[PDB]
Design a protein around this ligand. Structure first.
Ligand SMILES: [Mg+2]
Ligand code: NA
Length: 282
């Protein structure tokens, strides 16, 4: 389906204009970046045996995904600010996020997200394990503090939520429990969540995990496999629009749902205030 749609989109500008015609209006963007140690080896097949966070003259998958998403959504972001957080490094493990800048100051445009990402990366100690509860909870706080303005949270990660050793017997890990609880609680706010998978994964159990999230007032969550889309045999500019559309085409209907449910522009009043850690850098 997304392939069939993207065949007719030759540029990200075309995608942006389509999002607008589909009803997307003022829209804010939050970015969360996975700094787990697994990034060192999840590029075995997908990134020529280099770390997914490897910095060079060519953009790694994080930089690629940020660029495509940022360029597609830039026109809708009236103040051009992008709250950006890391998680999964040694300073946060699966418990916290850190802000890209001290005092939680937001990036000014996706270009600054990219620049600051490159500044931060070599200074980090990569760790784990993997939970998306802290980053989703951070996004909830930002939405609440904005007085209910519509946000899209884009999480870019190289693995599924950490599973229980006893997953085969139907048991959930604390990471899974908290992450699912956060996705559900997030649906009480005007917030859309996009989990972008980069690297080798594996990702086969992710879309099953997504399918089994408890029923919510609106479908506020999607998984998109960047690796799989980019590994396809077609034009790069077409793979890029297919990724953009796969990630974002569901955003305008979700936005419309936040209006229908009257979530837009109001405070929920029951959102714990998560505090981001400072960036663990010089
Ligand atoms: Mg990982
Ligand atoms: Na904004």
């Amino acid at each position: 389906r997304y392939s069939k749609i993207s065949d007719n989109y030759s540029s990200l500008l075309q995608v942006s204009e389509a999002l607008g015609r589909a009803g997307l209006e003022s829209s804010n963007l939050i970015v969360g970046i996975d700094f787990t140690k697994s990034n060192e080896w999840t590029g075995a097949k997908s990134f020529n045996r280099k770390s997914l966070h490897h910095l060079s003259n060519t953009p790694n998958p994080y930089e690629q995904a940020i660029t495509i998403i940022g360029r597609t959504l830039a026109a809708f972001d009236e103040d051009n600010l992008i709250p950006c957080y890391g998680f999964g490094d040694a300073s946060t493990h699966d418990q916290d996020v850190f802000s890209f800048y001290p005092e939680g100051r937001f990036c000014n445009g996706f270009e600054e997200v990219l620049a600051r990402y490159r500044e931060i990366v070599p200074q980090l100690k990569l760790a784990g394990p993997t939970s998306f509860a802290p980053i989703i909870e951070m996004a909830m706080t930002v939405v609440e503090q904005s007085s209910g303005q519509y946000h899209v949270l884009v999480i870019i990660a190289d693995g599924q939520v950490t599973r229980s050793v006893d997953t085969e017997h139907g048991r959930l890990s604390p990471q899974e429990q908290k992450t699912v609880d956060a996705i559900v609680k997030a649906s009480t706010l005007p917030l859309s969540i996009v989990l972008v998978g980069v690297g080798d994964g594996p990702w086969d159990m992710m879309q099953e995990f997504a399918d089994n999230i408890p029923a919510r007032a609106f479908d506020n969550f999607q998984f998109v496999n960047f690796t799989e889309i980019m590994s396809k045999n077609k034009d790069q500019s077409r793979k890029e629009t297919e990724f953009a559309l796969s990630a974002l085409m569901a955003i305008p209907p979700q936005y419309k749902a936040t209006i229908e449910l009257n979530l837009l522009g109001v405070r929920n009043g029951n959102i714990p205030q998560r505090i981001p850690l400072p960036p663990p850098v010089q």
